[PDB]
Design an enzyme around this catalytic site. Sequence first.
Site, PDB file in Angstrom:
ATOM      1  CG  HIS A   1      -2.025  -0.715   1.413  1.00 54.35           C
ATOM      2  ND1 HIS A   1      -1.859  -2.089   2.151  1.00 54.35           N
ATOM      3  CD2 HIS A   1      -2.623  -1.523   0.054  1.00 54.35           C
ATOM      4  CE1 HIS A   1      -2.512  -2.135   1.709  1.00 54.35           C
ATOM      5  NE2 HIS A   1      -3.399  -2.399   0.880  1.00 54.35           N
TER       6      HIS A   1
ATOM      7  NE  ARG B   1      -3.579  -8.351  -2.478  1.00 50.76           N
ATOM      8  CZ  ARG B   1      -4.299  -8.886  -2.198  1.00 50.76           C
ATOM      9  NH1 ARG B   1      -3.915 -10.256  -3.071  1.00 50.76           N
ATOM     10  NH2 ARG B   1      -5.855  -9.257  -2.337  1.00 50.76           N
TER      11      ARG B   1
ATOM     12  CB  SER C   1      -4.552  -6.400   5.014  1.00 54.45           C
ATOM     13  OG  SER C   1      -4.016  -4.856   4.926  1.00 54.45           O
TER      14      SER C   1
END
Lengths: 158, 156, 158, 157, 156, 157
Positions: free
Chosen positions: C17, C89, C126
Site C-alpha cells: 500500500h 498486486r 493485509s
Amino acid sequence: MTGAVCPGSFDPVTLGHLDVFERAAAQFDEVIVAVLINPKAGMFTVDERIEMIRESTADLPNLRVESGQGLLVDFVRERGLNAIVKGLRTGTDFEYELQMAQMNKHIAGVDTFFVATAPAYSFVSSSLAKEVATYGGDVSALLPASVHQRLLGKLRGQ
Amino acid sequence: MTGAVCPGSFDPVTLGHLDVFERAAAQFDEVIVAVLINPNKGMFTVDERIEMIRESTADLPNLRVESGQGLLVDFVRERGLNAIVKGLRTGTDFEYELQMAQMNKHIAGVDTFFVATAPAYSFVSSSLAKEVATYGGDVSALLPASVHQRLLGKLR
Amino acid sequence: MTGAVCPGSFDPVTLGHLDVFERAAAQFDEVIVAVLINPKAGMFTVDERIEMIRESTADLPNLRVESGQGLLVDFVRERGLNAIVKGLRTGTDFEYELQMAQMNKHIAGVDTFFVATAPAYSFVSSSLAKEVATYGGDVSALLPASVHQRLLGKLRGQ
Amino acid sequence: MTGAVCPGSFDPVTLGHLDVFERAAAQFDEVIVAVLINPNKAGMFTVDERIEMIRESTADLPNLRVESGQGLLVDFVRERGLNAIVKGLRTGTDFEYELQMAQMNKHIAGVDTFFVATAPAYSFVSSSLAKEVATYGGDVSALLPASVHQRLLGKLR
Amino acid sequence: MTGAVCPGSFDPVTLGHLDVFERAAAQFDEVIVAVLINPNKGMFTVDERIEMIRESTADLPNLRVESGQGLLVDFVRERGLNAIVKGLRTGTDFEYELQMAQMNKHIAGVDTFFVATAPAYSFVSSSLAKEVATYGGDVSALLPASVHQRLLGKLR
Amino acid sequence: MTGAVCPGSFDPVTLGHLDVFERAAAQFDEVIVAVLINPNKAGMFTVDERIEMIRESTADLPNLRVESGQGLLVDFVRERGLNAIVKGLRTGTDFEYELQMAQMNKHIAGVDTFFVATAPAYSFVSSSLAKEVATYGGDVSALLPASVHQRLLGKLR
Ligand SMILES: Cc1ccc2oc(=O)cc(O)c2c1
Ligand SMILES: Cc1ccc2oc(=O)cc(O)c2c1
Ligand SMILES: Cc1ccc2oc(=O)cc(O)c2c1
Ligand SMILES: Cc1ccc2oc(=O)cc(O)c2c1
C-alpha cells in the site's frame, strides 16, 4: 508541475485512444502523446499519425504530440517526466503490459498508470478497425471524423 | 533416482531462468537444461548459450546442459526421464503452456511441473533484456555477470 | 490543482500500500488516503488504521488520511477531485476492479488509475500478512516497522 | 428456421472442432461450417482438401453443410439469412481477442456470437499444435478424425 | 423445435440480463428464464423477480419465466431441452462458469452457450446495482424502468 | 532423499487429487499428503474419514503416506525435513491466489511450490462442486474414487 506520456503507434488513432488522452489531460498538468517511429511501416506515415492526433485533440490545450524512437523511458525522462498513462481495452495483452511496466520502473524509475477505456470504445483497436474497414465494414462510430475520412482515402486508393 | 528437464532457448540465460534451475536442482536428483536448436532463427549461438548456462550453474553439480532439436518429450524420454520443469514469470502465456503440458502428457506420458520465479526476476525475459540493452538500458541486475558482459560485446 | 484518492480498508496498511501511496504522491499535487468504515470490523479500529498510515507516510507532505463510508465516488467528489489511484498486486481480483471502475466513471465521472506495486511487495496483502503472523511466520519485511510492532501487540494479547 | 455458422480455417479440422459442430447441429435447425480462406497465405491443405476432410467426418449430421469464404465473417453469415456464430473454446484460446471480435461483429452487423467449451478430451488440440507435433513424429491420431490423420502424415512426408 | 434455458437469481433483473434474454429469444424457438429459489437467502421475492422479468420481456413471445429449485440440469431436462444460455459481463468468474459447464455436460449432457452482454451493460450486476442505489447512486440507465421504480421503493 | 508435500482439505478427495498424488509419487522419492484441518470449521468428513478415504485409493503407491495438520503449511513441510509442495491445477482454480501463497511461502520459509495440471477428464471436479451436485442428486460417481462415492451419499442422507 505534473505530467504524463501517452505512448502508442496510433495507426490510426481511435476514439479509444482519444478517451484515454482526454482523461490523462484532465488529471495531469501536462500530457505528451508519444508516437512510435518503428521501421513495421503501417498504413500512415509518422507525420500523418501526428496530424490526425493533433486534429482530434484540438480542445486539449495542455496536450502536445511528438514522435520518438528507442526506449519509451528515455522519451519520458528527457522531457522531465516520469509517468506513463496507458489505456486498457478488450484484447489488451495486460500481462505483457505489466511486464513492461515493472521493467520500466526498474531501469528508469518511471511509473505506469493504467486506465480502462470507455465501454463504447473498448472493442476498437487500430488493427481491427483497419481490417474491418478494408472489407467494407462501417467503423465510423469508432474513429474521429477526420481519421475516418483519411482511412477511406487510403483504402480507396489501394 | 529422480530427474527433470528444464527447456528453453536461453538467448541469453537470465536470472529468472537461473532461479528456476536452482530450484529444480534442489528438488530432483538430476537436472538437464535443454537448449533448443531452432534452424528457423537468435543473438547467441547454441555453443555460446550452453557456455553461458554452464558458467551460471557452476555450483550445481547435479545439473548438466545439453542442446536438443525437435520434440521436447523425445529429448526427455531419450534420457530416461519423464518430467519437465518450466518457470513462470510476468508475461508468460500460461494458457499456451497448459495446452503444451496436456499435449506432452498425452503423447508421451511426460509430466510438467511449473514454478514461479522469484519476484525480483519476474519481469525479465531474454527478449526484453536484449531489447532494453540495445538502447542502452541497464539490465545488469537481471542477468548473470558473465552474461551481461557478453551481451555488451555482441551489441558493441 | 491535481489530486487523487487512494482507497482501502488497510487492516493493516502494508508496504504494498505504501509503495502505491508514494507513487500517487509523486505524480499528483494532492493525495487523500481513504480508509473504509465498514461494519466487518477487522483487527484494527479505524483510528488505529489511520494512525498507522499517518506514521508510515510522514515523509509525504502532500498526503493526508481520512476515513469514509458510503460510495467511494462521493468521498472523492466531496473533496473536489475525480480520480482514484488503486494498486495491483498478486491476487488482486482485477476483473472486479475493472467492473467497479467502469461503474464509478458512469455514475460520477470519476477516473480510476491502476498501478502495479513493486515486485518485492507484490505478494503481501493485509489478510495474508495477518494469517501468516497469527501462526508465527515472519512478515517484518512486508510491513512498516511501526505496523509490525502493533500487529505483534494485537496477537500477543489475544 | 434457426441457424448458426461455425467458422475457422480448419487446416486441418480436429476432434475439438467436430465436438463443437455436433453441439451446434444438436441445438440449431441448420449449421454452416465456414471455411475461411486467406487468399494471401496458403496453409497446409487446399480449400477442397479442408472441405473434404470436414464432410467425411460430419456425414452423420444431416443438418450441417460446409462452405468456404473470405473477407468479413459477418457478411458470410448475413448473406445466408442468419445472424449467429458458434465458436469453440479450448485450452490456449485467446478469449480476449474472441470477445473483441464478437463485440465488433455485433456492432457492425448485429450478429451474435455464442461460445461453447469443447470436451475436456479434445481441449488441448489445435490445428497448429497438431501439425507441429506431427511434424516431429508425435502421435496425434487420437485427436484428429480418421478423415485427417493419414492425409496429414502424407503432407508432412 | 429448438430451445434454451437462461438461469439466474435476477435480484433484480438488469439490462445486462435483458440483452442476453433478447439474443437467446432471437436464436432459439423457445426460451425459459429460470429464476433460482434459494432458501438459504435476496431483496426481492421470487414472485417479484418473476414479475419484473415478465414486464421487461413483454415483447418476447417465445420466452417464458419460471422459478426453479435444485439442479439446473434437471430443470432443463424436465422441460425437454438440453441447452443453457449464460451471459458474460465484466466481473464474471468465467473459470467457475467453465467448470460448471463441463460438470453440467458430464452429468446430464446439457450444453452451455456463453454470450457477452453489450458493452453498455457490461459493468452492471444485480449486486453492484443494489449497492450503488442504496447509497443514492443513479443506476437508472442500467435497469429496466419498472425495475428502477421498485428498487427505489424497497430502499425507501 | 527427494520429497514433496501434497496439501489440501480433501473433503472428500477426488480423482483430480489422486491424479496429482500419482504424478508426485512417480517423480519424488517420498510424498506426504497433508490433510489440513481448520479447527474452527467442520467440513463434511472428519479427519479420520478423510485420511481413510485417501489411504484406500492410494494403496498402490508405496512411497506415499497421509498425515493431518493445521497452522502453517510451511511448518508441516519443514518439520518433515522437506521443502517442496506439489499443488494441482484444475478448471476453477484461483491461480493468482495460489501464486500469492507460493511467493509468500518461499519468502517466509524457503519452500518451493510446483504446480501440475490435472488430467482433462478430472479437470472440472472439485470437492465443493462434487458435494453440491451430489446434494441435489447429480451423478458424480465417475469423478470420485470408490472409497468416497457411497460414503458421500451416506453423509447426504
Ligand atoms: C520512444 C517511444 C515512443 C512511443 C512508444 O509507443 C509504444 O506503444 C511503445 C514504445 O516502446 C514507444 C517508444
Ligand atoms: C528438443 C527441445 C529442446 C529444448 C526446447 O525448449 C523449448 O523452450 C521448447 C521446445 O520444444 C524444446 C525442444
Ligand atoms: C467511502 C469509501 C472509503 C474507502 C473505500 O475503500 C475501498 O477499498 C472501497 C470503498 O468502497 C471505499 C469507500
Ligand atoms: C434450478 C435452478 C434455477 C435457476 C438457477 O440459476 C442459477 O444462476 C444457478 C442455478 O444452479 C439455478 C438452478
